[PDB]
Amino acid sequence: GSSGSSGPAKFTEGLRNEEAVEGATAMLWCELSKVAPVEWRKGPENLRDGDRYILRQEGTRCELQICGLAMADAGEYLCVCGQERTSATLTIRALPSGPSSG
């Protein structure tokens, strides 16, 4: 926090529940009152800028991509930023693997 603006960050839009398909890459983004290092987490689990987890930040907006979705992923994701934090609810859709219909 050097050469910026004194004070923590505040979620302007916040997270938002969503859904997806098994095997696909979910999409969760959240804006803030200023560019700050956020921390993506999932309840008992812990996410971070890694391989399977494609994290990105173009500024006051943080984009999160979960490579390899599954029934598990479906739950509640939280994003910690500064002194604030938000939560959301993701929904997974079992792949059509098998019964060809859609």
Q: From the alpha-carbon coordinates, what is the Rg to the nearest angstrom?
A: 15 Å
Number of strands: 8
Outline the biggest β-sheet: 5 strands, mixed
Structural class category: mainly beta
**Given the structure, what is the number of helices?**
0
CATH domain topology: Immunoglobulin-like
Topology as a string of helices (H) and strands (E):
EEEEEEEE
Alpha carbon gap, first and last residue = 50 Å
Strand order of the largest sheet: 1-8-7-3-4
The structural domain count equals 1
Strand content: 35-45%
Which architecture per CATH?
Sandwich
| Portion in helices | under 10%
| CATH homology superfamily | Immunoglobulins
- Molecular shape: elongated
CATH class: Mainly Beta
PDB class: contractile protein
Keywords: Obscurin-myosin light chain kinase, Obscurin-MLCK, Obscurin-RhoGEF, beta-sandwich, Structural Genomics, nppsfa, National Project on Protein Structural and Functional Analyses, RIKEN Structural Genomics/Proteomics Initiative, rsgi, contractile protein
Assembly: monomeric
Entry title: Solution structure of the ig-like domain (3449-3537) from human Obscurin
Describe this structure in words.
By secondary structure, the chain is mainly β. It has a single domain (8-95), classed as Sandwich (Immunoglobulin-like), CATH 2.60.40.10. The chain is built from no helices and 8 strands. A hairpin with a 2-residue loop joins strand 7 (76-81) and strand 8.
Features:
102 residues, mainly beta, Immunoglobulin-like, 3-stranded antiparallel beta sheet, 8 strands, Obscurin
